[PDB]
Amino acid sequence: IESIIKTATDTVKSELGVVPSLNAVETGATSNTEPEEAIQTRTVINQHGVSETLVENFLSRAALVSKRSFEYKDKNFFKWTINTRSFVQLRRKLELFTYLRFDAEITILTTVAVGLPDLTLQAMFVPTGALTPEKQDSFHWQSGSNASVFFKISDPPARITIPFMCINSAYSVFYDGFAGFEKNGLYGINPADTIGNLCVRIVNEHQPVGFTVTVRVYMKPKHIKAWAPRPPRTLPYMSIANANYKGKERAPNALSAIIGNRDSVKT
Amino acid sequence: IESIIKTATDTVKSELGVVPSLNAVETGATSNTEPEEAIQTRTVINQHGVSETLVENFLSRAALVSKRSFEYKDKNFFKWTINTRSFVQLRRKLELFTYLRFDAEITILTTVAVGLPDLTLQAMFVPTGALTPEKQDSFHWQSGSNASVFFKISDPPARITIPFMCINSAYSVFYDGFAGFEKNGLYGINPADTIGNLCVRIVNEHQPVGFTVTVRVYMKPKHIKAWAPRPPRTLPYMSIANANYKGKERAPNALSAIIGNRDSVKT
Amino acid sequence: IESIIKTATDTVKSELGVVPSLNAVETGATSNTEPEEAIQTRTVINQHGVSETLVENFLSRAALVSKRSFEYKDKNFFKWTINTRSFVQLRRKLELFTYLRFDAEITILTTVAVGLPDLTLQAMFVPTGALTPEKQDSFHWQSGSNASVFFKISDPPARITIPFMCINSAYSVFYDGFAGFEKNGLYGINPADTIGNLCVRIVNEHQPVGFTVTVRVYMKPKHIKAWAPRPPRTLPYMSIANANYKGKERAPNALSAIIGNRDSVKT
Amino acid sequence: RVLQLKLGNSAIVTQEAANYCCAYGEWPNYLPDHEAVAIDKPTQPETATDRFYTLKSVKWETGSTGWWWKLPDALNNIGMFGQNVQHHYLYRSGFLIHVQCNATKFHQGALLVVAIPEHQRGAHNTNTSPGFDDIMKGEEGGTFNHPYVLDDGTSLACATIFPHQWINLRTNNSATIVLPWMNAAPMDFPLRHNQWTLAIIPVVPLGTRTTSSMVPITVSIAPMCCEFNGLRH
Amino acid sequence: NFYKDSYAASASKQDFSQDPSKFTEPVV
Amino acid sequence: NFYKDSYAASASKQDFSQDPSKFTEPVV
Amino acid sequence: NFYKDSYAASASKQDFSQDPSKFTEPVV
Amino acid sequence: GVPTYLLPGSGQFLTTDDHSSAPALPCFNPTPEMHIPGQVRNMLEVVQVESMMEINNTESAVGMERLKVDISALTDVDQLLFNIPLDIQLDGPLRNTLVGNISRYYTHWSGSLEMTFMFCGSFMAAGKLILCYTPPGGSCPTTRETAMLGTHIVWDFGLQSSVTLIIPWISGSHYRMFNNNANVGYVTCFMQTNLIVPSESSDTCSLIGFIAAKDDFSLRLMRDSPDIGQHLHAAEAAYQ
Amino acid sequence: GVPTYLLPGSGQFLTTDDHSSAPALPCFNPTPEMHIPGQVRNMLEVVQVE
Amino acid sequence: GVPTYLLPGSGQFLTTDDHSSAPALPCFNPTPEMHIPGQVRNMLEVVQVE
């Protein structure tokens, strides 16, 4: 039964010769034998807030999702199909759930390595269906309908909120199924799950400068509703396109042994 | 009958042996046979918002309307007669309507290509009737009555709202008529439709620097009331001054064939 | 009779064989024969706002009033006695009135021509009676009582409001009279009409740099009450100190002919 | 079922067309007081110009591309409308177009009788704007060079967004469009500007067993609710 | 809008009124 | 106006009062 | 949130509702 | 004064932002709003208008011949006149329509279409057709017996000259993405009878087909249209 | 403090803007408004004169 | 206008901040919330499962 839980629950003190009964575990019910029931307790008014375990507080961290250095004289720009599959520290944290519903909050952080130039950059967000650029000076950068954001380098980082643009009501993180309707379609790729493309270029023309532009993209998923939790992935990933597994050669996180072994069970 | 429509309309479930009647199509009435009437439906509470199809949401995108690089030692400045005819991605989107009533929101974005200089720029808006400059250092730049905006480069881009300055109550996008009252007047050019001139110079004096100043102007039409929609232009444009047409040599968007052909109609 | 007029006035429709009477023009009364009275009219609800013809809207434009480049190693600074006599586009617009009462809103715009330096500037406003500086490093710049404003170059332009500091209740734009009480006094110069002195220097010490500092001052008169309108000056000016006239050699704006001639009056 | 439309002194016997086309859902009216500019009293011929000026019937054969009449360039040189146009400086008028294409029951075809507001034409395969003699044809009107793209690069396939009716020679032989005043300005210049453009385009061409076939299309334009200003001569 | 001119405001994206029956049904 | 001086405010562009009959009719 | 879009707001970290008895007790 | 700190995204020029900006012309009085007929306040008003499909979008159909489908008297019974794939995405008979051109400014589309066919024969010309709406997923039917089983309408000419065929909205997802998709639906049309003209009517009639969108149509995620894009004459005359 | 972000057009000097600016002379008492005859409060008063 | 001064920590990008940011798609209508079974609103629901 749904109820508002702000803090962790209290403990009631317990009460020679109590007589309990049997347990139901084979039915798939986690045992609700309270510590009040089983063992000797005291009254603990538990004021421990549960707020940092909330799914909104569990996933809204501006994690680095894209980092490329492009030289400047994909040459002279970079595009990035917005996925959560990129860095496996965030990927395992979002593969805990089956269906996610989040608004991304992209923060493009631009740094320049080698009298530093104050360049101007354009982070055009191309959704799926709109055409993506192929040069630094293509006519797609000057598109009216795409959501370009023009930011310099010596400023705060450019931050835009990308909404929930799945055509379904949640992102299928795991898609047990095939894309399209032709049988050569790729497994585990939902066509609805595609965010778009975040194309960043340098708006300036060709400058004789020897400076490399490192661009970091920080996605903070927010307004997160998450459904159907899953086992946390224990084996190492093999590709961003699928859930293949190989494991380490030995424990921990191996195929034959996820937990690091000990000598015996009576150790 | 006028009514407030915020979301797309619902569907009512339908009801062996219904007997409809004839249809009125030759009278220029689009068939209001609802899906409730014709085919078997269910009750779909349609919550799909129509708000992104609104004319205000269809045209208020800060589209690039002017982009010139001028060297700095029209030399040393540039002027631009404010038209929507410049880039044909916005032009086709505004040639959907006959009469438009929009307040432009000009955003001048200045970039410098080749120790970058922090120049100061003046984007003086010369309306039609006021004189336009002919040099970088003419006496028209120091005009009191023109709406100059003084912006540097290392700052946010200068943004001004140009109002609706047509002398008529809407912009004739298409003017089936002739300018003036002499019979040599140009076709399709309304003298009321002229916005003005956006003249941008570099306020600084002559600096021995080898830097090229690329200036982008972003017009976002806003407070848009639009009238009398038109067929979307399918053939490629031939000039910004008129609605001439040539078409591609072959389909698609050719004169003899707008739609790309197939083998047969029974394909 | 005084009345609030926000829009231009309406027209009432008129009414075989009306019989008007004579007219009074020699008495210096402009003819109040309404178009309702004389000719056939219709009812025109005139919604044309008159707000841009208001004297506050007619003169509050930040017109360029002072522009000097001073080299930096009056050398190394410049002072400027605040007058409206400087640029004749604003001067003719303020010589429409006899008595003005405006608060100036000075906006000092500093640009540097020839690794640009970020200098610091001081725009000290010396009113009349306080001493004006004679060097860049005089002890008058460090005066406590003068209203110095310290602004850099890479910033927004420094803007201060100078109040209405005439000792009379309005500025005599035209002073039919002589200054002081000695008969060598200059004609048309009111000692009360003097604003002060706007002295701008570079606060920095002597830098071996080859950069010229161009300083623009933008006065926007505001809170304007204006009295006793005048004929607009048609002939070209001859000096800022007086209302002398010479005219062009030929029409237009000549002494013998202000209006450009035609062939005959029956042309 | 047959009907007579009598505006002014001109009358036309018509078929009762169900649902006459009020263009953009509006009926033409005189200029209201809160939308007027020119202060002088507008002349208003209440039956002298508000009458059916039946234009010349154009022959619709099999190979006809279309016809266009720019209003009021069709009517500037005709009658009391043509006297008031050339003796005033402004005008404001709706129109009641009654296109009637009288054919037998053995003729086939379909016309798009469409009334295009502000039909800025284009010329094919040149970057020169159309001249005064290519736009202001007069009573004779103009034949469509390329009716499939409406002679301005747009599409005929989307031309039903305009006020339009169909003359399908099965169902009806007439179409009626009731045009309001369609301009940004409350009055305009009839010798310079042409607000509407009656375009009759045969989408499905004519047909019968004999190859030499012809059906005349009668166009009748009644300028409703005329105003004018600037009376001279 | 902290400006004094009503055209200077942000784009009023709130006009949800329709009247499709001046295009789909322009008839009488 | 967050300044303490009333002359420092923005330009009060609101004085729609007229009296043309001190110029067009300066008579008695 | 001074933007006009409700998805643009800061993260609403206030949903303290739970229902653990759809996971620990998914039974009838 | 007021203690303020700069957020990230400060000084950025987002091209889709909605902020009040500085008016260049202070106390400007614009030209008053005169009631111009036919105001579009929403682009779904433009989409709900019928507009001709180019059903005969084949070769050897020059221009005007692409909008009509010739019903001959030399054609046979149970023959396929046309099939119209319902890809607003792909370059088919729906791309140059009002529903097709305004939706290609968008990415997601959802709603019921509405095909209307109009027979343009003579008054005496009788015969029948059968307009078979195939739902998505199902392939294009080939025989008329295969297609008198779908959602068809057996349409006689000599009685009824225009037929509304409601294309319903059938999708699991709320929306359909436009691509840079097969079997969105098919409207096929078969000769139930032969074309029956007298000896003075033409023996080659025609069909004009329209398509609109119903009142439940919707569109979101605006993009640029593929229908246009690129030399353009006198483009530097706006500067010079 | 107050989280603020800079819009485009920040630091621009529009010559037709209408903003309060910093008074150079604090607690200055201007010369009181004496009723001078013939005040023009609108330039259409000047135009309506023959 | 409003007299503001910049605090320390102005222009920083704290990766755990909670601020409203500029929506890239204005008047975007997201796909409506369909009731999907088994919503986790707190990760202690995941922990309490055997």
TrEMBL record, chain D:
It is found in: Host cytoplasmic vesicle membrane; Host nucleus; Virion. It comes from the Viruses. Coiled coil: none annotated. Interacts with protein 3CD. Belongs to the picornaviruses polyprotein family. Acts as a primer for viral RNA replication and remains covalently bound to viral genomic RNA. VPg is uridylylated prior to priming replication into VPg-pUpU. The oriI viral genomic sequence may act as a template for this. The VPg-pUpU is then used as primer on the genomic RNA poly(A) by the RNA-dependent RNA polymerase to replicate the viral genome. During genome replication, the VPg-RNA linkage is removed by the host TDP2, thereby accelerating replication. Protein 2B: Plays an essential role in the virus replication cycle by acting as a viroporin. Creates a pore in the host reticulum endoplasmic and as a consequence releases Ca2+ in the cytoplasm of infected cell. In turn, high levels of cytoplasmic calcium may trigger membrane trafficking and transport of viral ER-associated proteins to viroplasms, sites of viral genome replication. This is Genome polyprotein. It comes from Human enterovirus D68 (EV68). The lineage of its organism: Viruses, Riboviria, Orthornavirae, Pisuviricota, Pisoniviricetes. The chain holds residues 81 to 313 of 2188 of the full protein.
From TrEMBL, chains E, F, G:
It comes from the Viruses. It is found in: Host cytoplasmic vesicle membrane; Host nucleus; Virion. This is Genome polyprotein. The chain holds residues 31 to 58 of 2188 of the full protein. The gene is POL. Capsid protein VP3: Forms an icosahedral capsid of pseudo T=3 symmetry with capsid proteins VP2 and VP3. The capsid is 300 Angstroms in diameter, composed of 60 copies of each capsid protein and enclosing the viral positive strand RNA genome. Belongs to the picornaviruses polyprotein family. Homodimer. Interacts with host GBF1. Interacts (via GOLD domain) with host ACBD3 (via GOLD domain); this interaction allows the formation of a viral protein 3A/ACBD3 heterotetramer with a 2:2 stoichiometry, which will stimulate the recruitment of host PI4KB in order to synthesize PI4P at the viral RNA replication sites. Interacts with capsid protein VP1 and capsid protein VP3 to form heterotrimeric protomers. The lineage of its organism: Viruses, Riboviria, Orthornavirae, Pisuviricota, Pisoniviricetes.
UniProtKB/TrEMBL annotation, chains I, J:
It is found in: Host cytoplasmic vesicle membrane; Host nucleus; Virion. Transmembrane segments: none annotated. It comes from the Viruses. Protein 3CD: Involved in the viral replication complex and viral polypeptide maturation. It exhibits protease activity with a specificity and catalytic efficiency that is different from protease 3C. Protein 3CD lacks polymerase activity. Protein 3CD binds to the 5'UTR of the viral genome. RNA-directed RNA polymerase: Replicates the viral genomic RNA on the surface of intracellular membranes. May form linear arrays of subunits that propagate along a strong head-to-tail interaction called interface-I. Covalently attaches UMP to a tyrosine of VPg, which is used to prime RNA synthesis. The positive stranded RNA genome is first replicated at virus induced membranous vesicles, creating a dsRNA genomic replication form. This dsRNA is then used as template to synthesize positive stranded RNA genomes. ss(+)RNA genomes are either translated, replicated or encapsidated. Interacts with capsid protein VP1 and capsid protein VP3 in the mature capsid. Belongs to the picornaviruses polyprotein family. This is Genome polyprotein. It comes from Human enterovirus D68 (EV68).
